[PDB]
Ligand binder design. Structure first.
Ligand SMILES: Nc1ncnc2c1nc(Sc1cc3c(cc1I)OCO3)n2C[C@H]1CCCN(Cc2cccc(S(=O)(=O)F)c2)C1
Length: 208
């Protein structure tokens, strides 16, 4: 049972801007996703101070980067706090509406796409390099879901039938045909070193 949803017009507008604007420095997507993973790892660590039981779904706090040339995917995996169905359908968009407006205001005033993370919507920078994004996520006290969107104004949510994760989020980037450089070990290493070098969690780059 797959549910189909329309993005708020403001989010659809943001995604179109990311897809349509000529902007050569696409590699910033990876910093934005790693930063989101780090923040989600922080969140579950903090929650666990008052309530140790929230690590019952996994004590290890880390990030994996998994390239796959057969599937033409780059997956960013974390064991952070995860997202609920209510998040995927309602709450993320509610919060992202404000950040999107500020970001577009800043772009008018002369900012560039590389500062998107200051507005809380760096996730959508995935669409610089991906034709489709699939998000697998599991939050304590909710089920594992698959969110998916190829932009175009809509997204889908299903209960995920795949391998159970425990707790956390997988962002699966289905890369555009001309963006397969982000599957190459040397390129990913370069980018993580340049932009994500002080992240306070292990980042494991899987080999093909
Ligand atoms: N890896 C990750 N792990 C966990 N979470 C991640 C994440 N990546 C992202 S970004 C992302 C990923 C997406 C997306 C949109 C975005 I925008 O659509 C499909 O998938 N988020 C979502 C976070 C990013 C920081 C701002 N919050 C606000 C918030 C909302 C609701 C509830 C709370 S609360 O419980 O603390 F009150 C807070 C959401």
């Amino acid at each position: 049972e797959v549910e189909t949803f329309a993005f708020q017009a403001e989010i659809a507008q943001l995604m179109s801007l990311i897809i349509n604007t000529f902007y050569s420095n696409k590699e910033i997507f990876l910093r934005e996703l790693i930063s989101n993973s780090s923040d989600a790892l922080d969140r579950i660590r903090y929650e666990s101070l008052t309530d140790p039981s929230k690590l019952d779904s996994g004590k290890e706090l880390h990030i994996n980067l998994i390239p796959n040339k057969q599937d033409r995917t780059l997956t960013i995996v974390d064991t952070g706090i995860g997202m609920t169905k209510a998040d995927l359908i309602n709450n993320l968009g509610t919060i992202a509406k404000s950040g999107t407006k500020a970001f577009m205001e800043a772009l008018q005033a002369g900012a560039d796409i590389s500062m998107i993370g200051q507005f809380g919507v760096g996730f959508y920078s995935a669409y610089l390099v991906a034709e489709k994004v699939t998000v697998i996520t599991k939050h304590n006290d909710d089920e594992q879901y698959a969110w998916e969107s190829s932009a175009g104004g809509s997204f889908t949510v299903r209960t995920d039938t795949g391998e159970p994760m425990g707790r956390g989020t997988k962002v699966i980037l289905h890369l555009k045909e001309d963006q397969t450089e982000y599957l190459e070990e040397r390129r990913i290493k370069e980018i993580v070193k340049k932009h994500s070098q002080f992240i306070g969690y292990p980042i494991t780059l899987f080999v093909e």
